[PDB]
Design a protein around this nucleic acid. Sequence first.
RNA 1: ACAU
DNA 2: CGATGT
Length: 136
Amino acid sequence: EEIIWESLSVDVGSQGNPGIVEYKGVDTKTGEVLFEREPIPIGTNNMGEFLAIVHGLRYLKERNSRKPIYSDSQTAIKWVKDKKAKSTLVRNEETALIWKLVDEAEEWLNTHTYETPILKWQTDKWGEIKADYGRK
RNA sequence: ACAU
DNA sequence: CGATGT
Ligand SMILES: [K+]
Ligand SMILES: [K+]
Ligand SMILES: [K+]
Ligand SMILES: [Mn+2]
Ligand SMILES: [Mn+2]
Ligand SMILES: [Mn+2]
Ligand SMILES: [Mn+2]
């Protein structure tokens, strides 16, 4: 209904899908970039959206912040809730890095706690999430 | 269909 | 146009 401006917004960016994946987190209120992940040579949109949320959880927990996280990814929100990233990406040598990061993110979820609300950014009403890469 |  | 996902 109403945007919660006191929040962290996250998003993936890619060159190809599957392709080069990165992500970033921004202050929803100001657009200030709070974190950015070095590009990963091969991954999927959904793996990156998932890594972005989990990194957000870790970032806010480390800083003792109760802000919610916005994501535009129905898929990634569900994967975080399930603590399981149900990606179809083949596991092979060239996908090893993204899969290691995904496996490590799931492992973190399974060994830590958080109350952070993970909210759907309503693109149809509000436009692109503030962490968007501007590539579409 | 909806979400990327 | 095509890919990733529920
Ligand atoms: K979008
Ligand atoms: K984009
Ligand atoms: K589809
Ligand atoms: Mn997105
Ligand atoms: Mn796993
Ligand atoms: Mn985007
Ligand atoms: Mn388009």
